[PDB]
Design an enzyme around this catalytic site. Structure first.
Site, PDB file in Angstrom:
ATOM      1  N   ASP A  16       0.813  -1.225   0.000  1.00  0.00           N
ATOM      2  CA  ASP A  16       0.000   0.000   0.000  1.00  0.00           C
ATOM      3  C   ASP A  16       0.841   1.268   0.000  1.00  0.00           C
ATOM      4  O   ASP A  16       0.396   2.315   0.489  1.00  0.00           O
ATOM      5  CB  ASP A  16      -0.953   0.038   1.206  1.00  0.00           C
ATOM      6  CG  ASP A  16      -1.820  -1.201   1.316  1.00  0.00           C
ATOM      7  OD1 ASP A  16      -2.275  -1.722   0.278  1.00  0.00           O
ATOM      8  OD2 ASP A  16      -2.067  -1.645   2.456  1.00  0.00           O
ATOM      9  N   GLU A 208     -10.900   1.017  -5.032  1.00  0.00           N
ATOM     10  CA  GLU A 208     -10.245   1.465  -3.802  1.00  0.00           C
ATOM     11  C   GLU A 208      -8.895   2.084  -4.158  1.00  0.00           C
ATOM     12  O   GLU A 208      -8.531   2.203  -5.330  1.00  0.00           O
ATOM     13  CB  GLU A 208     -10.052   0.315  -2.810  1.00  0.00           C
ATOM     14  CG  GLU A 208      -9.189  -0.833  -3.356  1.00  0.00           C
ATOM     15  CD  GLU A 208      -9.188  -2.033  -2.425  1.00  0.00           C
ATOM     16  OE1 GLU A 208      -9.975  -2.026  -1.456  1.00  0.00           O
ATOM     17  OE2 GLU A 208      -8.393  -2.972  -2.641  1.00  0.00           O
TER      18      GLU A 208
HETATM   19 CA   LIG Z   1      -3.336   4.752  -0.335  1.00  0.00          CA
END
Ligand SMILES: [Ca+2]
Ligand SMILES: [Ca+2]
Length: 472
Positions: A16, A208
């Site tokens: 991430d 997302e």
């Molecule tokens: Ca992010």
């Protein structure tokens, strides 16, 4: 000096990752997986950085913020998920994150890009909207923030699956200079998969993981699409509206690349963004390991932004930040493979499938001493499997020393293509015990840059820990 993918050491698991250049160093701000982890993002947030002009030298800057610093999470029962960091208009560093599926965006602040970060507040409405309450609407998820060239601050978030209430797409709002208070109710700027039907975004809707960057004067908004394994981009002239669909930048199994449908590597979620470092642009993403979605590792590739603003899809590689192919001398961990498949490799992500447990996969085993003593290798290699590397600069390579073990009776072939049709050597595999051993395989490879592939045929399983080049 050399660097491979993943760019952090093999014992580190930072998925991430948001890449930002602060005071001459490229910091990566991701979440924190554990080797053999059993759930997403189980560690406290760390950061690592390299000098912006030498991306082959990454150093660990320590833990920068802990799970229990958010007032909503006093016992640390919830994890902290994918964060972002911006240098705010006041010159300080602001870290944005959500606790695991908690419908609020938390914010911490530091004077240094390496922390320590202290809890700042939760993103909230202004006094005149909704009583000024904490923002909990449109499923706060995967925050991303931009401090624009003029000093204004824009937030992007949302979770929009297609498979309580979720996002219809990527939501966005301008924040006040307190870095907490929105100027207005968030609005949608990129359609989710449902609303994407009928649009240029169709089939690649927002899901997302937004990441916002300025490219010259333009706004580039990356996101993980409904496919989840790819990072896509949209471009606008304005930060919160007018986004036109770009395309796929990277898939962690190269799905979509040249119309490819079968992945070259185990698929899973993907998260990250682009960054300008040196005179070049890179994309940072992550890969999956351990046959789960809980042991992820950051990778990167150079990209090209064409004169018209478009970004063609790039293939995943083993050399990533190296600035060129790797030397075909010395020894290499098998765990830097950018090709990894067998006959069970799934086309659709499904981590409940019991086949994942016995699939070919990169794993780690703790060993006496430091994390740098930990063993990484590929396990569960059976017939039909292929393991591949990109790219090596072959000069006078005569042989390969493969360190393997297991109870395999068959043929290890060596090729320069994933289809194993450009065969350059091969070995009989006769090992039926369980102790590591080196096998020299002669190879006829003409000088120049090539990909390198190992294909196994026969019965049994084998494990593969390292390979080394034997030159003249
Ligand atoms: Ca992010
Ligand atoms: Ca770690």
């Amino acid at each position: 000096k050399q660097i491979t993918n993943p760019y952090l050491p093999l014992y580190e698991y930072v998925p991430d990752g948001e890449p930002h250049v602060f005071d001459g160093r490229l910091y990566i701000y991701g979440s924190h997986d554990l080797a053999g982890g059993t759930r997403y993002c189980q560690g406290d947030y760390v950061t690592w950085s390299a000098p912006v002009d030498d991306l082959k030298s990454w150093r660990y800057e320590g833990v920068i913020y802990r799970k229990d610093q958010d007032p909503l999470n006093p016992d640390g029962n919830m994890e902290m998920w994918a964060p972002d960091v911006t240098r705010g208009p006041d010159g300080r560093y602001y870290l944005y994150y959500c606790l695991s599926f908690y419908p609020a965006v938390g914010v911490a602040v530091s004077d240094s890009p390496a922390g320590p970060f202290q809890f700042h507040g939760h993103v909230k409405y202004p006094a005149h909207i909704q009583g000024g309450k904490t923002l909990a609407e449109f499923m706060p998820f995967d925050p991303a923030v931009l401090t624009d060239a003029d000093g204004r601050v824009y937030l992007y978030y949302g979770f929009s699956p297609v498979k309580i209430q979720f996002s219809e797409g990527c939501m966005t709002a301008e924040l006040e200079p307190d870095m907490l208070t929105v100027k207005d109710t968030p609005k949608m700027c990129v359609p989710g998969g449902k609303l994407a039907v009928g649009t240029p975004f169709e089939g690649h809707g927002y899901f997302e993981a937004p990441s916002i960057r300025k490219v010259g004067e333009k706004y580039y908004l990356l996101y993980s699409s409904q496919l989840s394994h790819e990072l896509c981009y949209a471009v606008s002239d304005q930060p919160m509206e007018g986004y036109a669909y770009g395309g796929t930048i990277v898939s962690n199994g190269d799905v979509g690349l040249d119309g490819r449908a079968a992945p070259v590597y185990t698929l899973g979620n993907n998260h990250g963004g682009i960054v300008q470092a040196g005179g070049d642009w890179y994309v940072f993403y992550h890969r999956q390991t351990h046959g789960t979605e809980f042991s992820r590792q950051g990778c990167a590739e150079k990209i090209t932004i064409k004169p018209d603003g478009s970004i063609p899809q790039v293939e995943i590689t083993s050399c990533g930040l190296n600035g060129g192919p790797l030397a075909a001398g010395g020894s290499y961990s098998a765990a830097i493979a950018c090709h990894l498949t067998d006959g069970t490799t799934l086309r659709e992500i499904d981590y409940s499938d019991p086949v994942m447990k016995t699939q070919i996969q990169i794993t780690e085993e703790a060993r006496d001493g430091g994390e740098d003593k930990n063993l990484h290798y590929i396990r569960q290699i059976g017939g039909g499997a292929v393991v591949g590397y990109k790219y090596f600069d072959f000069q006078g390579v005569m042989a390969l020393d493969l360190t393997v073990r297991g109870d395999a009776g068959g043929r290890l072939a060596v090729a320069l293509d994933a289809g194993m049709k450009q065969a350059v050597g091969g070995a009989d595999l006769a090992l039926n015990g369980g102790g590591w051993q080196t096998v020299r395989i002669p190879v006829t490879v003409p000088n120049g840059v090539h990909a390198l592939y190992f294909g196994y045929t026969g019965e049994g399983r084998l494990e593969f820990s390292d390979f080394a080049f034997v030159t003249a």
